[PDB]
Nucleic acid binder design. Structure first.
Lengths: 196, 135, 179, 97, 52, 175, 124
RNA sequence: GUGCCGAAAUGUACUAUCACUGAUACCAUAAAGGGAGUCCAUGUAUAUACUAGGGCCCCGAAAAUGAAUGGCGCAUAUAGUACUACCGAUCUCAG
């Protein structure tokens, strides 16, 4: 079960990577779905979504395509396009996905991978505007955008206290490893570091 | 044999030979591979990984080479006969002249530092690549 | 040495032109003009990826001008003319498409024309001696597989970044990988 | 028969549209055309349990496919579509190296 | 296979002459000699209005 | 890739005139077979000499005296676009004449959007730093050239060692 | 502010291609995208390379533009020493040593790491 | 044909592009006419003024159920150019 810090990423680039490795048969959480960032100015990104809102079934709206405004189900929809989701293999694969706005209390402990070719540095040029998913959703009416920021602050304080302890462990580990290098030998230290 | 093949003297017209070439009878009178070699870079007393059948992940030393592509293994945990299909040649080569003798292999490997511990150890695959593993 | 003599003098040694060619049919049968498949039936190149040796004179070159989109062809060297006939060579004897096997096949057909064994037959191709068309007719059409690079563009000529038509010397580069 | 390199069954061989005689496996840790040439020749084995009767299926590697290190592979009984996703064992003999 | 070793050598022996420092500068001097004089003005039409 | 070629050709001897004038053309093509066809295009178009009555004497392949060092290259060309023909003097900085000519076929197809069919070169020659007049290429002939490599690549150092995950985040800064 | 610019006479570790992992100096500039470069370990011919497949380091040789081969190699003798001594350049040698490691030597590395981790675990 | 759906390089090398916009023959529409948008550029005069033009992009450009570069999406998955590797038909070749 992978977890993906999806801050910094592009929506379609991540979704193309994620949707492929779902079909290979692997469970995959992503987290921080709101800090995924699309190409375009804020004007341009909103006008794309306002076209998507028009698309309703005329006889009745209830059977119409649903317009999910939360970032965690905007991203889930972009992945659903790239999987054959109507088949049994696609519906099994799509069930293995997970998106969360703000990394929740379950997945704080897990080691978080960052798939490098979907980062907005590598794929967009410099001097071209980009917007977040959270910024867009709030504009499109998501009402919990404000709440998520509050939660991040509480978490990132507690994540800082982990690292100040983890420094103190690894510093005295290096001072312990300073002693053990003399016990093995001069030439044994070369074989570990350099490889002879 | 392909001797007794002769050209027909007929010029029947049912069948016509366009150039000088004439129709051929192809008849006789009524009266009547591979070497499978031994593999180079498996000498007498090379250290070898066994990857097939009964023994897997167990190293062995080739006491002697039978020939015809089959070699007889020896070592601590010994004396079995298996082909080059089931073997991977390591670079390291313990000096043993003698045929079979399981006692001499541990005695000879006691010369080279921690080679006796090396031979009895299992070989196993882990997380993080055999193609790239240079042996 | 005849080339290096003329450069030291001043002149140019222009070489002798190609006496024969080797004509792969690149494109298949259908959607094709009747004059332009009468011409392919005359070279015995009916199936796709078939080839024979063709002698070059103003009869045969002007025929090849009509059929240039359908074929790739060029001027093979002696090592290529060899290696076709030893590997893939077959004798069309009494309309049977027989494999070449042994030299007693081609002594019986061609011995009266002073071509005894497969070395003498291959020679009669690449020197284009007096009994060429006997030796060429004796050979059945070659049958080659599609080559292990592929090739870029069926429907353009080699000269304009494609495949078909005359490629002079570089047919040897193609036939190596067709074989 | 333990000792294998894990490898998923990612798809059957197919066109765009049409697909079961042969299968494609992404061997773990292999990412190149020249990297995956090592496993050409070698013997795969699928395995599955029926409760108290563990069967085995072989299983071989023919050629590399594409530039991603995916490798072609016959089996004697060709695989069911229920295996799509699941692991198989790429055992590393016969090894000429 | 003896003959095709000799022909491989003789065709390779020509590439020693072709890629020699003496011969290449002659061919490059021929290529520099071949090129035309520098044009003073580009543009499709020069346009001249001499009186009468 | 393109290789500079010098091709010399002539018409056949008539009984009226044995030993006519031969003519040479500088041409740029991937191999000797294409270089003949470029010669017969230019010879027919201008000097009125056809394939069907003419020899072709010597396809000389022009190799460089040194490809070790960098040279400036002026390229005078015409290129044709629908409704008009334009004359342009463009120049480049490269190891060889061929690599300059390969550059401008990309640059014209990029910038102006015309193919090598429409393009017709007048003159290529190497050019000194004094006579060079274009500003963006003059800057590389000066001393004390610094530019940073802003935007680094993420590629595999070898194609074996590529991956689609990472713990740490890559830094694409120039530094 | 960018520290380390592409310059005439700068050492660089070429990451991509046939010459991957080998130090080399930029004897002459050509373009925005491209440089002439001289490889100092291997003794290939000098040739043009893209800067994007190149990557850079701090150290800079005093040389003239289009320097002679072997003359420019003498300028680099101080900085190749400073490269491999520095901890970024130790990982170049470590990849290389590990890459050529052979069967038996991997058992030696595993056993010395067990002796390392045992003696460290005492001191807690 | 090779981001994912979808088998196969988000390949290497080289030039253009910001637009509620563009995206592969037949083909499923857009013109005359404009633009100190940007890149490339011809001739003259004195860093600067005057323009011969060319691409890409913008305007010109409005219809009725909600709507379709095939979709998702992309902005180095858009527009051109060159060279290799690779997938792919009941063709071709081998049995």
């Amino acid at each position: 079960p992978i977890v993906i810090d999806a801050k910094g990423h592009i929506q379609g680039r991540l979704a193309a990577a994620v949707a492929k490795q779902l079909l290979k048969g692997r469970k995959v959480v992503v987290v921080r779905c709101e800090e995924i960032e699309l190409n375009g100015q804020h004007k341009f990104t909103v006008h794309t979504y306002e076209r998507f809102l028009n698309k309703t079934t005329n006889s009745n709206p209830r059977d119409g395509p649903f317009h999910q405004r939360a970032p965690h189900e905007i991203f889930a929809r972009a992945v659903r396009g790239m999987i054959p989701y109507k088949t049994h293999r696609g519906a099994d694969a799509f069930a293995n996905l997970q998106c969360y706005e703000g990394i929740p209390a379950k997945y704080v402990s897990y080691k978080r991978l960052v798939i490098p070719h979907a980062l907005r540095c590598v794929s967009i040029h410099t001097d071209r505007p980009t917007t977040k998913l959270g910024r867009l959703s709030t504009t499109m009416g998501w009402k919990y955008g404000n709440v998520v920021a509050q939660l991040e602050e509480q978490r990132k304080a507690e994540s800082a206290k982990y690292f100040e302890a983890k420094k103190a462990a690894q510093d005295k580990r290096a001072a312990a490893i300073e002693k053990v290098n003399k016990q093995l030998g001069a030439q044994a230290v070369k074989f570990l570091e350099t490889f002879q | 044999e392909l001797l007794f093949i002769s050209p027909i003297a007929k010029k029947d017209i049912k069948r016509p030979s366009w150039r000088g070439i004439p129709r051929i009878s192809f008849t006789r009178p009524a009266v009547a591979a591979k070497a499978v070699e031994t593999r180079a870079n498996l000498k007498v007393g090379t250290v070898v990984i066994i990857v097939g059948g009964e023994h897997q992940g167990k190293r062995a030393v080739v006491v002697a080479d039978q020939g015809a592509g089959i070699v007889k293994v020896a070592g601590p945990v010994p004396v079995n006969e298996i082909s080059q299909d089931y073997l991977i040649a390591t670079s390291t080569s313990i000096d043993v002249a003698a045929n079979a003798t399981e006692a001499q292999v541990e005695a000879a490997a006691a010369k080279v530092p921690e080679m006796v511990d090396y031979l009895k150890a299992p070989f196993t695959i882990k997380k993080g690549r055999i193609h790239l593993m240079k042996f | 040495d005849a080339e290096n003599k003329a450069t030291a003098e001043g002149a140019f040694y222009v070489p002798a032109e190609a006496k024969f060619a080797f004509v792969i049919r690149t494109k298949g049968t259908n959607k094709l003009h009747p004059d332009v498949r009468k011409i392919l039936h005359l070279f015995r190149l009916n199936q796709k990826h078939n080839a024979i040796f063709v002698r070059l004179n103003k009869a045969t070159i002007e025929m090849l001008k009509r059929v240039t989109p359908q074929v790739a062809f060029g001027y093979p060297s002696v090592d290529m003319v060899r290696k076709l006939i030893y590997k893939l060579g077959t004798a069309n004897l009494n309309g049977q498409r027989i494999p070449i096997a042994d030299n007693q096949i081609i002594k019986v057909a061609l011995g009266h024309l002073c071509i005894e064994s497969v070395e003498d037959l291959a020679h009669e191709i690449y020197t284009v001696g007096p009994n060429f068309a006997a030796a060429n007719r004796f050979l059945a059409v070659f049958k080659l597989h599609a080559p292990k690079g592929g090739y870029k563009k069926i429907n353009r000529a080699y000269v304009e970044g494609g495949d078909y038509g005359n490629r002079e010397h570089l047919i040897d580069e193609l036939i190596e990988r067709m074989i | 028969v333990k000792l294998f390199v894990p490898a998923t069954f990612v798809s059957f061989r197919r066109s765009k549209r049409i697909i079961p005689n042969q299968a494609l496996l992404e061997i773990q840790g292999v990412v190149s055309k020249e990297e995956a040439q090592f496993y050409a020749g070698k013997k795969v084995a699928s395995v599955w349990k029926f409760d108290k009767q563990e069967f085995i299926n072989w299983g071989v590697i023919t050629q590399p496919h594409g530039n991603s290190g995916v490798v072609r592979a016959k089996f004697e009984k060709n695989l069911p579509p229920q295996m799509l996703g699941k692991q198989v064992r790429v055992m590393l003999y016969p090894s000429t190296i | 296979q003896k003959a095709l070793k000799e022909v491989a050598e003789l065709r390779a022996a020509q590439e020693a002459k072709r890629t020699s420092p003496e011969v290449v500068k002659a061919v490059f001097a021929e290529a520099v000699a071949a090129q035309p004089a520098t044009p003073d003005n580009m543009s499709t039409q020069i346009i001249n209005h001499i009186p009468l | 890739s393109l290789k500079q070629y010098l091709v010399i050709g002539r018409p056949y001897p008539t009984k009226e005139i044995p030993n006519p004038p031969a003519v040479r053309v500088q041409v740029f093509a991937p191999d000797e077979v294409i270089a003949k066809s470029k010669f017969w295009t230019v010879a027919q178009r201008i000097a009125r000499l056809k394939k069907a009555h003419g020899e072709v004497l010597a396809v000389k392949h022009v190799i460089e005296p040194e490809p070790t060092r960098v040279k400036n290259y002026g390229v005078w060309l015409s290129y044709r676009s629908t409704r008009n023909h334009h004359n342009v003097y463009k120049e480049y900085r490269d190891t060889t004449t061929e690599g300059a000519a390969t550059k401008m076929l990309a640059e014209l197809a990029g910038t102006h959007d015309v193919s090598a069919d429409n393009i017709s070169i007048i003159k290529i020659a190497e050019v000194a730093d004094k006579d060079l007049v274009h500003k963006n290429i003059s800057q590389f002939t000066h001393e004390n050239i610094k530019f940073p490599m802003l935007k680094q690549s993420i590629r595999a150092p070898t194609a074996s060692a590529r991956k689609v995950f990472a713990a740490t985040r890559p830094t694409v800064c120039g530094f | 502010p960018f520290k380390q610019f592409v310059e005439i006479g700068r050492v660089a570790l070429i990451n991509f291609g046939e010459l991957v992992d080998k130090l080399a100096i930029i004897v002459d500039i050509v373009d925005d995208k491209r440089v002439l470069i001289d490889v100092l370990e291997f003794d290939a011919p000098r040739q043009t390379i893209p800067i994007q497949r190149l990557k850079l380091t701090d150290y800079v040789a005093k040389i003239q533009r289009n320097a002679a081969p072997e003359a420019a190699k003498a300028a680099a003798k101080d900085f190749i020493k400073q490269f491999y001594e520095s901890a970024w350049g130790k990982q170049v040698i470590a990849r290389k040593n590990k890459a050529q490691m052979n069967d038996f030597q991997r058992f030696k590395y595993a056993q010395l790491e067990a002796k390392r981790d045992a003696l460290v675990a005492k001191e807690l």
